[PDB]
Amino acid sequence: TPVTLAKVIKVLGRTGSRGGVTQVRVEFLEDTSRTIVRNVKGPVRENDILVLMESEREARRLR
């Protein structure tokens, strides 16, 4: 199984109708120089480490 680690570099804001989701730009660790935007589920700050379960795929909006 292929884990992928990414460091939060910028906090974008809350999505979701309810507004508990948070958009973030992450620089993955095992080879930087490439950024992806994911959607969280917990509280998040600058420099936390997300385990992207699948490495390439990214979202935007959320109703």
Binding site: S17, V21, N39, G42, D48, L50, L62
Partner: peptide, 22 residues
Amino acid sequence: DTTRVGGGGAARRQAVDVSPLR
């Protein structure tokens, strides 16, 4: 994990990557 996104009445479920804290 997942959350209950709208997407219109019949609410699908948008996969999310969850925080470490969570």
